[PDB]
């Protein structure tokens, strides 16, 4: 395992994914913190195993351009063109990078592989360079020739190449963009979402790794949408995170703190987008915990410190169960100095808040505001789904699936139709409780006809049950999972004309890949 190849020659949406996917597979160390692949630690990789060679091809051939890609961060540190090797200046000469390609030219550019440098030398920004097959086809040709009196264009070219390989490896969002370039043969400029993903790749890894057990960030990471709207990410469980394919190595979870275990104070949103609230702001012992709209101010009765001891705290007091039986209510109570079992919860990344002593879960048996919460038998219903984080408004976007087609609401039915920007039926609200709702009808949910039946057609129905078939999780897999089922969302027989998205065991790839679009 050393050399992955890609060619432009008759390139398909499939073969670019196969290439990206193959590069992700060797860049993955077996480790998978919080469920997302991370890359190998530098002090762990011997110089011998420190590189992948990426062999790119072209029409105006005849030997390929080979990039040296560092397994540690997916940096393009050098590239070869026959006898000649070209290297990027570096802030800290690594033993490994020099000696990487012996028996070869060795020229070093006066610039680094960073974007600030490359843009500087290129004389334009990332948002001004077209991306796509033609741009890559020209970038490859220009890196083949490697004319040192040009150089402006060498640096431009590396911007094309790094974005279309390394960035795509890291994000399924940008991988999507290039697939759409190949399908429509239409070049594209990098939109502000793609630039923010590339800019915040390091931060996202840091946030995820240094998160508590449960995936809650200590600080949000600020991303962008297409159009320049701010996107705040507060946990691994945020649906946008599902497009984060592979992370930089930062640390290992619990001159270097292996990984901090913070105790963040966050809102907890769930059922119908409502918030876990200490009723009327009162903290007398035994006072109920309820559903209530999310306040976005800083009143203390909606803020919960998720402490390491497993308690969940608002003000000075602890989130507590009144008893260990199906139907018993959850309340505020004093935290004890031995710290009792009725006050310990695991808040799981999937969105369940479970009291370990009773194996019963935080539930909302009733969809309306002021409904008293409730430990219940875990059935992974949406009713029983939750999300830590201060940005509580449902993320609104397109769900792209098979053949880069978009889910579209059609009355009581959903199925994937060709993507088209004005939507509005194609817009989906990704709720805090795991449900997918049509933008223009937020009383209705993306629901299984029968969650017990494999092959059951998924419809749009009333959210009012808050059932098993109304919770969905966007997985690093790229699948949409049903917890409880173990089953995935699926386009029948990879055939969109059947108008049926169904519930099916994990295959095989393509007809079961989904991306909540950023």
Ligand X SMILES: *[C@@H]1O[C@H](CO)[C@@H](O[C@@H]2O[C@@H](CO)[C@@H](O)[C@H](O)[C@H]2NC(C)=O)[C@H](O)[C@@H]1NC(C)=O
Ligand Y SMILES: *[C@@H]1O[C@H](CO)[C@@H](O[C@@H]2O[C@@H](CO)[C@@H](O)[C@@H](O)[C@@H]2NC(C)=O)[C@H](O)[C@@H]1NC(C)=O
Distance, CA of 30 to CA of 35 (rounded, Å): 11
Distance of CA 238 to the CA centre of its chain: 7
Q: Which is nearer to ligand Y, 114 or 265 (CB)?
A: 265
Which residue is catalytic, options 75, 79, 380, 431? Answer: 75
Question: Counting contacts by CB under 6 A, is residue 320 touching ligand X?
Answer: no
| Structure tokens given for 451 | 């969650």
Q: How would you write 273-314 as a 3-class SS string?
A: HCEEEEHHHCCCCCCEEEEECCCCCCCHHHCEEECCCCEEEE
Q: How many residues bind ligand Y (CB under 6 A)?
A: 6
Q: What is the nearest approach in angstroms of ligand Y to the Cβ of residue 324?
A: 31
Of 76, 90, 83, 82, which is closest to residue 105 (Cα–Cα)?
A: 83
Question: Counting contacts by CB under 6 A, is residue 506 touching ligand X?
Answer: no
Question: Counting contacts by CB under 6 A, is residue 265 touching ligand Y?
Answer: yes
Distance, CA of 86 to CA of 496 (rounded, Å): 47
Q: What is the nearest approach in angstroms of ligand X to the Cβ of residue 351?
A: 7
Question: Counting contacts by CB under 6 A, is residue 352 touching ligand X?
Answer: yes
Distance, CA of 108 to CA of 239 (rounded, Å): 42
Q: What is the nearest approach in angstroms of ligand X to the Cβ of residue 463?
A: 21
Question: Counting contacts by CB under 6 A, is residue 182 touching ligand Y?
Answer: no
CA distances for 384 relative to 214, 287, 373, angstroms: 16, 21, 10
Q: Which is nearer to ligand Y, 265 or 372 (CB)?
A: 265
Chain residue whose CB lies nearest ligand X: 350
16 is catalytic: no
Q: Which is nearer to ligand Y, 104 or 265 (CB)?
A: 265
Q: Which is nearer to ligand Y, 45 or 266 (CB)?
A: 266
Which residue is catalytic, options 80, 170, 179, 444? Answer: 170
Q: Which is nearer to ligand X, 7 or 346 (CB)?
A: 346
Question: Counting contacts by CB under 6 A, is residue 329 touching ligand X?
Answer: no
Binding to ligand Y by CB under 6 A, coded x per residue (else -) over 371-410, reads -------------------x--------------------
Q: How many residues bind ligand X (CB under 6 A)?
A: 6
Q: Contact, 202 vs 174, CB < 8 A?
A: no
Distance, CA of 474 to CA of 481 (rounded, Å): 6
Question: Counting contacts by CB under 6 A, is residue 232 touching ligand X?
Answer: no
Distance of CA 259 to the CA centre of its chain: 20
Distance, CA of 462 to CA of 460 (rounded, Å): 7
| Structure tokens given for 484 | 């409880």
Question: Counting contacts by CB under 6 A, is residue 264 touching ligand Y?
Answer: yes
383 is catalytic: no
Question: In a 3-state reduction of DSSP, which class is residue 338?
Answer: coil
Q: Contact, 459 vs 450, CB < 8 A?
A: no
Q: Which is nearer to ligand Y, 262 or 455 (CB)?
A: 262
Question: Counting contacts by CB under 6 A, is residue 303 touching ligand Y?
Answer: yes
Q: What is the nearest approach in angstroms of ligand X to the Cβ of residue 473?
A: 7
| 350, 363, 374, 451: residue in contact with ligand X (rule CB under 6 A) | 350
| 348, 357, 413, 423: residue in contact with ligand X (rule CB under 6 A) | 348
Which residue is catalytic, options 115, 176, 380, 431? Answer: 115
Q: What is the nearest approach in angstroms of ligand Y to the Cβ of residue 264?
A: 5
Cα angle 9, 11, 17; round to 5: 140
Q: Which of residues 22-41 bind ligand X (CB under 6 A)?
A: 35
Question: Counting contacts by CB under 6 A, is residue 298 touching ligand Y?
Answer: yes
Element (H, E) at 159: helix 152-162
Binding to ligand X by CB under 6 A, coded x per residue (else -) over 464-483, reads -------------------x
Give every CB contact of residue 255 below 8 A, 6+ residues apart in sequence.
none
| Structure tokens given for 40 | 């190998």
Q: What is the nearest approach in angstroms of ligand X to the Cβ of residue 213?
A: 8
Handedness of CA 343, 347, 348, 353 (dihedral sign): positive
Question: In a 3-state reduction of DSSP, which class is residue 198?
Answer: helix
Q: Which is nearer to ligand X, 65 or 487 (CB)?
A: 487
Q: Which residues of 58-81 are buried (b: 16+ CB within 10 A; e: fewer)?
A: beeeeebbbbbbbbbbbbbbbbbb
Which residue is catalytic, options 167, 175, 198, 425? Answer: 167
In total, the chain counts a number of residues equal to 518
Q: Please choose which of ligand Y, ligand X, none residue 349 contacts, taking the beta carbon within 5 to 8 angstroms, the exact cut-off set by kind.
A: ligand X
Q: What is the nearest approach in angstroms of ligand Y to the Cβ of residue 222?
A: 11
Q: Please choose which of ligand Y, ligand X, none residue 303 contacts, taking the beta carbon within 5 to 8 angstroms, the exact cut-off set by kind.
A: ligand Y
Question: Counting contacts by CB under 6 A, is residue 266 touching ligand Y?
Answer: yes
75 is catalytic: yes
Q: How many CB atoms lie within 10 A of CB 116?
A: 9
115 is catalytic: yes
End-to-end CA distance of the chain: 33
Question: Counting contacts by CB under 6 A, is residue 355 touching ligand X?
Answer: no
Distance, CA of 325 to CA of 360 (rounded, Å): 8
Catalytic residue set: 75, 115, 167, 170
Residues that bind ligand Y (CB under 6 A): 264-266, 298, 303, 390
Residues that bind ligand X (CB under 6 A): 35, 348-350, 352, 483
């Amino acid at each position: 395992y050393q050399t992955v190849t890609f060619t432009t020659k008759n390139a398909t949406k499939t073969s670019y994914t196969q290439f990206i996917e193959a590069l992700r597979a060797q860049l993955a160390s077996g480790e998978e913190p919080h469920g997302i692949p991370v890359m190998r630690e530098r002090s762990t990789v011997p110089d011998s195993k420190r590189f992948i060679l990426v062999e790119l091809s072209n029409w105006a051939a005849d030997s390929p351009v080979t990039l040296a890609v560092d397994v540690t961060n997916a940096y393009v540190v050098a590239y070869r063109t026959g006898s000649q090797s070209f290297f990027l200046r570096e802030d800290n000469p690594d033993p490994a990078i020099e000696n990487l390609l012996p028996d070869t030219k060795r020229y070093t550019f006066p610039f680094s592989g960073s974007y600030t440098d490359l843009e500087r030398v290129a004389g334009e920004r990332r948002e001004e360079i077209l991306l796509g097959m033609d741009p890559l086809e020209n970038a490859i040709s220009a890196l083949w020739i490697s004319n040192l009196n040009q150089q402006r264009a060498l640096a431009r070219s590396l911007i094309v190449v790094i974005q279309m390989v390394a960035e795509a490896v890291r994000f399924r969002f940008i991988e999507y963009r290039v697939r759409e370039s190949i399908s429509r043969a239409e070049m594209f400029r990098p939109d502000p979402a793609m630039l923010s993903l590339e800019n915040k790749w390091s931060a996202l890894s840091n946030a995820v790794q240094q998160s508590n057990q449960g995936g809650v960030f200590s600080s949000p990471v600020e991303l962008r949408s297409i159009s320049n709207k701010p996107v705040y990410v507060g946990s691994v469980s945020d649906r946008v995170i599902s497009g984060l394919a592979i992370m930089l190595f930062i640390c290992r979870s619990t001159n270097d703190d292996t990984c901090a275990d913070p105790e963040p104070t966050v809102r907890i949103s769930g059922r119908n987008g409502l918030c876990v609230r200490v009723r009327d702001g009162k903290y007398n012992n035994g006072n109920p915990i309820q559903l209530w709209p999310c306040k976005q101010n800083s009143d203390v009765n909606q803020l919960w410190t998720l402490r390491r001891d497993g308690t969940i705290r608002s003000n000075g007091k602890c989130l507590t169960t009144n008893g260990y039986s199906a139907g018993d209510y959850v309340m505020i109570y004093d935290c004890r100095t031995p710290v009792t079992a009725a006050s310990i919860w695991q808040f799981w990344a999937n969105g369940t808040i479970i009291n370990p002593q009773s194996a019963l879960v935080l539930s909302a048996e009733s969809g309306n505001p002021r409904t008293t919460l409730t430990v219940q038998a875990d059935i992974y219903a949406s009713r029983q789904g939750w999300l830590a984080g201060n940005n509580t408004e449902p993320f609104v976007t397109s769900i792209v699936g098979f053949n880069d087609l978009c889910m579209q609401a059609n009355g009581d039915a959903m199925w994937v139709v060709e993507c088209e920007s004005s939507k509005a039926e194609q817009k989906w609200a990704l709720y805090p409780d795991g449900s997918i709702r049509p933008h223009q009808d937020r009383d209705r949910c993306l629901t299984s006809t029968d969650n017990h039946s494999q092959g059951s057609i998924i419809i749009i129905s009333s959210c009012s049950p808050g059932s098993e078939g109304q919770r969905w999780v966007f997985m690093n897999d790229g699948t949409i999972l049903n917890l409880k089922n173990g089953l995935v969302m699926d386009v029948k027989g990879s055939d969109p004309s059947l108008h049926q998205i169904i519930i099916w065991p994990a295959t095989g790839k393509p007809n079961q890949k989904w991306l909540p679009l950023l």
